[PDB]
Design a protein around this nucleic acid. Sequence first.
RNA 1: UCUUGUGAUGAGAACACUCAUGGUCUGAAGA
RNA 2: UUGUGAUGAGAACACUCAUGGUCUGAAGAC
RNA 3: CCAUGAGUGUU
RNA 4: CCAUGAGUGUU
Lengths: 122, 122, 375, 375, 227, 227
Amino acid sequence: ASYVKFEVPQDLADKVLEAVRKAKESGKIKKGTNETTKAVERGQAKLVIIAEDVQPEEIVAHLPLLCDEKKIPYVYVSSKKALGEACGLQVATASAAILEPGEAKDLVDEIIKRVNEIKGKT
Amino acid sequence: ASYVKFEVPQDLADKVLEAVRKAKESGKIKKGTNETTKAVERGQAKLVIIAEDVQPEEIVAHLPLLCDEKKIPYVYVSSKKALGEACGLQVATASAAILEPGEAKDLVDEIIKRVNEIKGKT
Amino acid sequence: KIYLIEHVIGAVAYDENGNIVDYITNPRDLGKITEELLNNEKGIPFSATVELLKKVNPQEVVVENEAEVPKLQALGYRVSYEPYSKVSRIFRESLPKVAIDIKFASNEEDYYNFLHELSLEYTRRKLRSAAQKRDLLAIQAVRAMDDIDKTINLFSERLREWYSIHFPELDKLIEDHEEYATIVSRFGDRGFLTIDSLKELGFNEQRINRILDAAKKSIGADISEDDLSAMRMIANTILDLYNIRRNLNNYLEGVMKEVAPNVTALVGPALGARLLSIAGSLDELAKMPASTIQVLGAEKALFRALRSGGRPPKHGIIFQYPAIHTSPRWQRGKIARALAAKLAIAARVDAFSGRFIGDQLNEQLKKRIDEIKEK
Amino acid sequence: KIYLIEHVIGAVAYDENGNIVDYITNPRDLGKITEELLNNEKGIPFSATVELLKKVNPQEVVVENEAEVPKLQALGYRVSYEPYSKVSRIFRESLPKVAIDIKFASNEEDYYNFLHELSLEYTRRKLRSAAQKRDLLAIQAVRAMDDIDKTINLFSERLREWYSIHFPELDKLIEDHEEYATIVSRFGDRGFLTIDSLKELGFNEQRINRILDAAKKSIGADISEDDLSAMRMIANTILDLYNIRRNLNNYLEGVMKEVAPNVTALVGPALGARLLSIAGSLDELAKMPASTIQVLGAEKALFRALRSGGRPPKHGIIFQYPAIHTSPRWQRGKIARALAAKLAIAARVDAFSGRFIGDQLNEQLKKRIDEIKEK
Amino acid sequence: ITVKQTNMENIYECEFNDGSFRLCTRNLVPNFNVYGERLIKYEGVEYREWNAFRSKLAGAILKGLKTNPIRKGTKVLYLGAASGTTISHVSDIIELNGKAYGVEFSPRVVRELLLVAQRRPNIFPLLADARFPQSYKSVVENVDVLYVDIAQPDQTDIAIYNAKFFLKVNGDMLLVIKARSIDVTKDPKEIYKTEVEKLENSNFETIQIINLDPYDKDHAIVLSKYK
Amino acid sequence: ITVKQTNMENIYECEFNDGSFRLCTRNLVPNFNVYGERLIKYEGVEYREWNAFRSKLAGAILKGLKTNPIRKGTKVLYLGAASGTTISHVSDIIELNGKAYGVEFSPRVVRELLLVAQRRPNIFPLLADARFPQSYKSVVENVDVLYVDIAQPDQTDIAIYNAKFFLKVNGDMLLVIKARSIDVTKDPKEIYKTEVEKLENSNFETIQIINLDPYDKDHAIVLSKYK
RNA sequence: UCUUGUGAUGAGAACACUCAUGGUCUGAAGA
RNA sequence: UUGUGAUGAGAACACUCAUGGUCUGAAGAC
RNA sequence: CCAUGAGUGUU
RNA sequence: CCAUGAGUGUU
Ligand SMILES: Nc1ncnc2c1ncn2[C@@H]1O[C@H](CSCC[C@H](N)C(=O)O)[C@@H](O)[C@H]1O
Ligand SMILES: Nc1ncnc2c1ncn2[C@@H]1O[C@H](CSCC[C@H](N)C(=O)O)[C@@H](O)[C@H]1O
């Protein structure tokens, strides 16, 4: 898909979903493309999660640029229902972000550092 | 002159000029056509004095209208130099007003009561 | 002693206790009662009052209106007046009825129907008199003329931003809005700018060379004829509006010399209308102290001053007088105080006589300005 | 491992300690250095850099810019990137000098002289591209169109107050400004009003009767031709401006369908243009959350709220969407929230692809409005 | 919908289709409205919705005016009739047997008051300055109520001068105190206080004082009896 | 009139015809002005009047700026060059040996910055986003002073990123803190405090903090050294 | 059961203007 | 020189552009 | 600028 | 609506 900047292996994609789940409980998260967007623009997000199965694609096409301006890391997952239901919703969610990791700190830190590598960063 | 509505006997004009003097010391007065005007529009004046020898005539032509709207009684005297020097100035003053009579209250009450007569009021 | 009452109903004579000594009913005719009421404003007694004052032949009469007395003295009678007299109060106490007694109307039904249709005619008549005042025409024109000033500036600011998509450099090269609009209007695309056509519009050469050189090296966008036509729409409108403005000015100076020449003499036609405009009328202007004229048009600054005890404005719309906005600020307060002062006089002579003294007024002013400027 | 640097100067290869392993000087040419910088934005490596990567045959290279990484991988090398590397800092610390050493310029004098004339051209070049963006034409045009609206209202309001001196009753009889203006423009004096001439303008009989009857019984002032022509100047301008406005509307719709069809599909050309105008560009609009789009143009209310913890505006310029300002108030918040939502989507697809989904986006929207109105 | 009489003659309330309650009056000239107001039929009678934000009198009622000296057949002198908003409702209340004499000096607005008065035999527009009651002396009668709503810094004194001309003894005066037109500097509460003092020194007996907020900012209204 | 050097390089004062004092700089391109400022000749030398209400930098000086890192031959990175008002004065100060790299992302205004930079070989205009220093990386060098005047909510974070690219260690940063462009809700004093702290946690050493009131409302300027 | 993070709910604050009426500096000293 | 107004007054009005500050967040309807 | 009354524009 | 920067009109 076209707003998908790099390739996430599904072990990583799942490492994410758990960091999200740990963050709902012990920390703070935002769910939905509009709240995600405000979270990046306000420089609050530590990780922005974008789903790969969104249509029309453009609904999230802007999140990678916004994340590049604010130097906030972003990751992909396969299913918008996976992520939606990960976030504690019973509907799908096209994007979301972790604002405060809480008890997922170590988990989120390993994620931004593995996506940094597949992105090619030293 | 044309803004001069009625005829003032100089016995009265003199009664006035003294009523002005008694008010400077013990009460409050305003001197000068502009301060006189503002005193009328503000309803401060208890008596408005206009000199009869003003030139150009129009400079005080409005005070009768102003005095009739706000129902403040007005009187004339012969000299603006009489009045000016009456007022405590060493120049002429084309008009002036008594806001607080002081020890001229009684002197002023008879003035408003004699000009009412030559004006024809019962 | 006889108390006289003048009313729509007719003229009634009263004794001091309140009994009708005699009466003369007015004709039940709208047209005629209107004219008598209008004239009674000027002091003129009803013609019904003169008839009654012959029938009764009274030693001392007393009227309601102080503007009537000299008119009736000149008719031979000894007269005074009493405001809100008991009798006049008494008369009006009985006014649904006494319309019937002195046989002006048969019943309440058409006393009140007549009175109603009188009032509509009386005030329709006054309303027409007000519309006929020359300074109203002055006031509306200067207001329209300012709307045009505002609008010209508004479209010019827009056009420059718009046209600068195609030719950004032209903006800082042509300072004059009427000029900029002309260039956009006649040429459009900057590639159509030549020495000759630019010279035929009276641009001097050192400038003509600067435009063309800028246009040649310009970093602007290529743009369709359709795009330029939208712009040139605004450009021609700015030009149209400039001609209307010049026209209105002529109309304005004309009316303004008729209605208030002394004021035009001091500040010019437009600033004069403007002062009229803010005052409401020449007569409202004529009643003002100089300390008010000096701050007309500066109410925002002024009421922030009077509210907080801060510093009041030195000049209102009067600031527009070249001698004030051109001089250094420490002179302005004084020049304004001088202007206000002369203006107040000028308006009174315009309102109360029509005698012309604008020349001695202008001259006295230019004296006082000179004294100030020598400091 | 070799750390690679890309600069105006050329391409330099570094070892990890900060010594020049090798270099390839850039041509001292404005045209080419500009083109390569513009391309390096897209990630395209310098042709001076591709040459350097052949001289050395390095196992590990690291570039400064991450958009370069994929381009050089396809060229055969193993690549990563390191931002603000110690190496890149070292390079630039030595940059007054290494311009001379690798023989790009003879001295400091014309390294900086060249670099200056490069920066002027580089940014001249970017300046020209930005100006070339189609949405700018849309934005200026709707801004001009709004100014014309503003002005039509101002002159119409002025004209009615002015013409009402001559003919006051006409004001409340002709509700429409373009109408009121035609009558003042075409007739002028109220005595010229005829059944026929009024019928030629599409006025129905019962209206024509009310006008003529009003005009005859009118309590207005008689007024000269000079006075009326002054008025009619303004009256004719209002008419001229209505036409200019209609033309601009047509122009707008044209541009707008090109540049943002999905947005036009939802809210029309003018309202879409207005939103662009407040956003600044289609690209800024496309990055906005719906919760912002919903309140664009209602900043006065919005920030008095965010400042005071008060109630935020339900809708900004979006209020102009008929379904919102026509509906009862309790519906508006919900309809606005829906409008904004679809607009946010519509804006992004116009911005990132140009693909059309405006038809379904509209249809989805009209469903959601129906559900609301059924409550 | 439902209309019901209130504690004051010819003034009614509406229950509405949704639950809003608005004052209204019995329309003296059916199928016509003077400003924009809603026309509503109930038990075949046509009422005019009476907006309290627009008319100070209707404003006062909702802010608890105990008693309304303006009722059926009252003869009332109205200083400051303007466009004709409030006076058209006192027209509906006093009802043909009553008379409303409307004094107003601004031509631009009497221009429209005219239109209200043609349709209502009830109302007598007088293009005149309330500072010179002598100018309309010769058309009006004495009256039961003196309603005064004028913006003039000397409004209260104007009201008084007009009273001793036209106000029946033991009649009522409704005086609107427009604080910001008397003095924008001073506090509106000071103004209310000093002006009622003017009334009492002119032997008006202060009956009630209402503050019109939020219908009208910096306004208070006085009901009193002339002695 | 008199012009005299100050405690800071190439910055002068004027005694004036009336007794008013204004900062000014030694004009690098005689007989030309960038905004509207007065051109003044004294001892056959041309100085440019430096308005303290227009330039944040001159504002800071008169409000007691301790040490001025911008002097002769200084190499400076300028974020937010705008029309070129302030940057033209730092141009006059650093004087041909020095370089001023002016980064500004607004085409409407770079348009006028262009005009200033042509006249001055001292100035290198960069139409670029200060959020992506990678975009002008390939044109500039590293610099002594990093002057930052950008209206952005994340300006301080933007400033830091630009420093670790181009600020020579032990170099200086002038940072203008625009409280109302960071958050109009919050109090400016709080904003100043939270931002200087962002700086100290990225090991900038706070040297001085000036409040630009009344030259610029709700603004402060921070001087610091990068480590 | 239906709509709903591709946005429910709330939101008593969409923006731009016109006229009418009133509130409209100081007060004796200066070179 | 000046009450036919000295002195004071660091507040004449009307606009344009650029940059930033730009709601809520899971429940509602039968 | 404030208050009141009547209104207009995008509609 | 607020802050900053550059400007315009009556002039
Ligand atoms: N001296 C005076 N004589 C007559 N009317 C006056 C007056 N001074 C002010 N007014 C009028 O007082 C009015 C105030 S607006 C009053 C609104 C009106 N009573 C209503 O509720 O419908 C203005 O229209 C003004 O013309
Ligand atoms: N992200 C960014 N990149 C480059 N410039 C930016 C920017 N964000 C804001 N700006 C610029 O910051 C400027 C703020 S005004 C600063 C003006 C200048 N320093 C002077 O004193 O004269 C604006 O011109 C704006 O274009």
